[PDB]
Amino acid sequence: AAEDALYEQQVRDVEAWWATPRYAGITRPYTAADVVSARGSQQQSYPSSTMARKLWNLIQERKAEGKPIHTLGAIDPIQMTQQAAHQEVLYVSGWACSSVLTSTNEVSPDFGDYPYNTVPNQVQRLAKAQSMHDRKHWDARRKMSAQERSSTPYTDYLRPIIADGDTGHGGLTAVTKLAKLFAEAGAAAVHFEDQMHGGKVLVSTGEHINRLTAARMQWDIMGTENLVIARTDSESGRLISNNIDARDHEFILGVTDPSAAPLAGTLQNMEARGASASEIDAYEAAFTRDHPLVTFDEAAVSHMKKHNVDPAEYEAGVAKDRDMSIWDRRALAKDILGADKPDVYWDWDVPRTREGYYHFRSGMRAATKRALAFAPYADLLWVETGDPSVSVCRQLGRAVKEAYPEKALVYNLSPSFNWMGHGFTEQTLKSFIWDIAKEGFVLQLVSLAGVHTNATATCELARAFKDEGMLAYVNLVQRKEKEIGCDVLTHQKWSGAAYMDRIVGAIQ
Template identity: 45%
Template structure:
């Protein structure tokens, strides 16, 4: 018998440290923060994927802050309302009024990609684009927090007591992760960037990364439910490896999507459309279009596709069976088939109702790219969001309009299975709100109304973009006509009237802060202070016996 080798003490110490870290992760997962979270991996898996040097991230503090904020809103039936910030000016000016910040992929795609090449929201920009914007805003938040503290430290206790309370510039940032920019490893790397650059939360949608579209464009292709669950698991695993509480928002585009990448997941089967007319048997649409591609003008190809689809009579399997049954039998069939585990199972149920010979073929209408036809609906969104909920902190249904009935149906459907799941809602500027059939009062009450349904995080994705466009689009022609009067009347006086701190833009940008730093370096005095006597910003100080020209500090 071979002698048993003694295990070196260094190895025993390494093993003990490993086991202690595993126990620490398991205890972390048992906290209230993760009471609703399911993981298909173990704490041992997580620790095995970590390095030995513990690293802390400021974004983790922001994530914990965001979690407490949203749970409080959810419990109160209220909502954190925010909008997409375009730059540090917007993010800082939002801080006194809004308790979270949003970073939109659409805004980044159109205004600030890491290659400076603008374009539509197709998620074809470099994948570090949105993390870079998050970092841009987060660094501004940190700086204005430091600047405010320096300003208040220079006050006497009596002055601080008389001054307005400090502004919380450190508003948690939730960022657009699009469709993860690829498979599980791409999603994990993207999430790592978000954590490192300051995001408190990330949302990821169930569209195909290679065919990703803005949620309000046509041509959206969904990946399977299982594939998106894998994306969410990859994101959560990355957060666990980094030991952060970063929030994960799962978005589904299943309401308006028309295409599905694969039928591999039975949970998607009830929403796949098939040909129900036996006359198209043996005549797949993709073959027809491929044989004529390049030979016919695009308009004629489109006409051929439209004619084929009309002849094929596309329906879901449940619709096809219902059309063949007596009306009196349809409710019982729909109730029985609602629990079908797959198309084959649904066919077995249909045969019990005497509908075993219904023609249904979901391969015949597939597109030239191989995609299946998908019947989008709130029911499809509920099914997908319910599958995503155990792996995410919030779920979000992208919609085509502000529809209270859809919100109620989505909330009721998800919460029937996951009563404590938090919901998110896009108050999109892609909607024509004036044509949504709402009164002004209904618009004003829309946010609190759906907050009662559990939509505790609500946001206007592109409000920063539109606000910027409105301001410059109205000022530029006015300036061209009226010169400096347009600037003074339309901007400078309005900044003063609304007490916007950028009126004194040198102070806003931190000149006082760096004067303090310079004096500290040089023993308390310097002849090169930027804000010393002679700075033009003295013109905005309050004049004795006159009107106040300087904005009152909000700090």
């Protein structure tokens, strides 16, 4: 039929699409029929998908060279226009949005607690400005001679946008709607982090995989090729919201002291009888001191050597199966111990927080494992590694390359770190970006760069303008703007006035 042919043609198309090199190694737990059944009859193309292909190709080219795509977080269209000739991509931060532009105009510290259309609205604001300045630029060039065009460098205002998706802002349907808004707004790529929606609390490995799968399916339904970026904060995240996933069990901490009674219960009982907030804090502090936390692997091997049993059989099994459940680990331990010896005591529930969070052994062991777990679901991997170290980066890069030799990584360049005070020289501060790009960190970003440049410039001017008036404005702004050749100096032309003049002249 008319509908049957269109359906069948799209199923064939989607299956072929997923077989292209763009999606080599990417796992999809759903089918092409699943996707086409959700599409309706109306096809639509999105500019973000052309930008996504531009970004994908740029990543492939720079990764092959061992070279960086390093950029600065931009908070407004002015910053976009001034980066366009220099940075090859544009980054949009949710931290920036939280304090400078929210969908409700209610700004706050970054808890990812703005309405979830906030960062997509900032993407749309930048993408529409990109299109305006590309149109102005194309109009300007058509007014030049053909040879003057060859003499003048082309400015590319259509740099692919990378945007912060936070944790996805709720359940899987929220993630699909957030991904939809981003593809509509213009984002070429979106990153999603393995923290709980609402210091840091991780979600299970499987929960985050499901978020990444939800974003991919929505873009598959839309027919767009936007890039999924998976971020993990398990290098520093000490709490996990959910113990259901066996791939996390080796990092969850528990007690070995059988005289420890569940902490959360004690704390609620205390609050019921009227105990002071400090008294609850004091007991919780003492409880952590009195009862040290270890992994079950650690408790088992300690129990075996204590009872004169070789742990090698256990250690081989957990090494062979990193993701062995706690249930199967206890089974393996008791067989090795046998009937005569007592069983390992270990309880991860007893020390849970008031919220019910479990304790988690953060570090690069957990972060590397999660990066590998996320790799078949993501186009780029973003691992927070702590303070900048070429050494740590090299280790992570090789660990990922040996399992997924084509996966590119992202690095978050800290704006606040004391580089010189922590071992760097001017030479090694300069080469850092290029040093880690050789190890596979292709996309690199100073998240809050546009916040800090803007704050510093206004701070300097505001103080001086109070006492020196227009002398301060000319010295600190007008003179400098002219010296460096900033094209906003002629603001009317910069804004596109000549472009609109021609259109109005054509209409009349």
